[PDB]
Write a protein that binds this ligand. Structure first.
Ligand SMILES: [Cl-]
Ligand SMILES: [Cl-]
Lengths: 297, 298
């Protein structure tokens, strides 16, 4: 059975034209949407959301297809799991709550939804924070031996179905724990709350949920890359003030120097490293929360 | 049991310091060593070896760790499954048969052993053929988005143990058949003799054998790349006359024009595409056999 890691947050199923979005909602004040990434669910914000809820209406959503959100049927171009489509669905979800102008922080895949949202629909955002990513175009453009070995799962999970699905089925508990462990600074599971790990393990135990994750990565290798490429070539920059945080031992800093990269993508960007591996809000909840509150306030 | 796909060939278990090499041996004439790659065994040569045995003493060996050869225990640097080490072990195996100067043809991993052997110990080789590869260094140097997706397994199987091993253990039959099928021109298993497929499947069903294949790929991402890097940055070229064959629909041509790449690595290289996917000796056996017979007979 799955622990409630957001005491005092409500639980909402938000209807959209592509399916329900699950969210925990707490706090009051300006709306702030928090988006998780792979292979996690909304519960990864559990150490940081209570501090944000002191000043904001905090909406902690499962991405489309992840966690308890509905899984829209995919197609040959992985359309519902492109970050453009995810952002449109989340915009529609926020409109259901009456939030048409809101603050947004995302981590990993959710940070990819977030900067794509800022490029497509900048009027929707007051401020944007992205945690431990560079834009998808930048990862692929920096693909070399070292990066290919480090983020091998970018090409592995993008392989045509059912290859990754079948292999992930070989040992799904091991795989999700291996990914969680290996991207931390400690290299084991000791930075995570065990009840959160159980949430991530249970979601990953569902074949349909694993398939959606592969569809996300397929979108990441194809349409998401092409969407980013158009913006790069057009010189389109994110106009929303943004914060780029990265782990000193994280994924973003192995590809490049992250604030220099983001300055090419955003007109108004601040940045700071956090002493952390990839999972900033769980490995370094206090430093992450402080930086987010300061930026959004 | 498993079919004998080399009627008339003998079977040898050759002792070396690093474990026994299994080989089929047939024919008569100058010695010719044939090396398979992944995820196969020596039986991949079964359609071309009899043609070659008309003219050569053909030794069809399982690579160290593959097939029925012994599996040296690996270490933190994947040392016995580096191509440098494999090459030394096969030189020792050939010396046990009295072959200190021989011809060599390799496919896939075996082709990587082969060009490494030629760089490290050129005096052992009369002539060399490599099938559907570029040097390991060139694959990694050309690793962009397109190619990372194409040969994702170069990165996946090189992940630290036991990650690939644990994933491969859920359904080994699926993966070996997926790799065999995906790299052929047709995209299925129709090019293979089903009796050969059983050899590959049975080898792949052994978890220790699967581990060895991962160690081979780990060596391929680390020490093999480093050894190649030294040679290419030093301008060390293979001095042995060599033949590069590749499939028009194979792996090597996705990265670059193969002959241009090989000219950078070899002082005396000829090249030819064959209409085939990766598995030249099985997809295009007659065309492969003829190219090899002509090259090694010159
Ligand atoms: Cl990501
Ligand atoms: Cl190869």
């Amino acid at each position: 059975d799955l622990a409630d890691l957001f005491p005092g947050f409500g639980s909402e199923w938000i209807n959209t034209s592509s399916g329900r979005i699950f969210a925990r909602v707490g706090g009051d004040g300006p709306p702030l949407l928090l988006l998780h990434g792979f292979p996690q669910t909304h519960v990864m914000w559990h150490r940081v959301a209570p501090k944000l809820a002191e000043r904001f209406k905090v909406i902690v959503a499962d991405l489309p297809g992840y966690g308890w959100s509905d899984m829209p049927e995919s197609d040959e171009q992985h359309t519902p799991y492109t970050k453009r489509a995810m952002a449109k669905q989340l915009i529609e979800a926020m409109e259901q709550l009456g939030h048409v102008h809101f603050a947004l922080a995302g981590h990993d895949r959710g940070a990819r939804v977030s900067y794509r949202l800022a490029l497509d629909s900048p009027g929707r955002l007051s401020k944007l924070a992205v945690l431990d990513i560079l834009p998808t175009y930048e990862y692929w453009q920096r693909m070399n031996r070292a990066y290919a070995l480090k983020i091998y799962h970018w090409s592995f999970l993008a392989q045509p179905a059912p290859l990754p699905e079948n292999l992930l089925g070989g040992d799904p508990d091991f795989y999700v724990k291996a990914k969680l462990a290996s991207w931390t600074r400690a290299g084991d599971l000791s930075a995570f709350d065990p009840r959160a790990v159980e949430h991530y393990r249970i979601a990953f135990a569902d074949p349909m949920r694993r398939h959606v994750m592969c569809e996300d990565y397929r979108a990441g290798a194809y349409a998401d890359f092409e969407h980013d490429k158009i913006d790069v070539e057009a010189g389109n920059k994110i106009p929303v003030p943004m914060l780029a945080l990265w782990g000193a031992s994280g994924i973003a800093q192995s590809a490049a120097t992250p604030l220099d990269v983001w300055r090419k993508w955003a007109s108004d960007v601040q940045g700071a490293p956090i002493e952390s591996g990839h999972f900033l809000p769980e490995e370094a909840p206090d430093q992450t929360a402080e930086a987010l509150v300061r930026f959004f306030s």
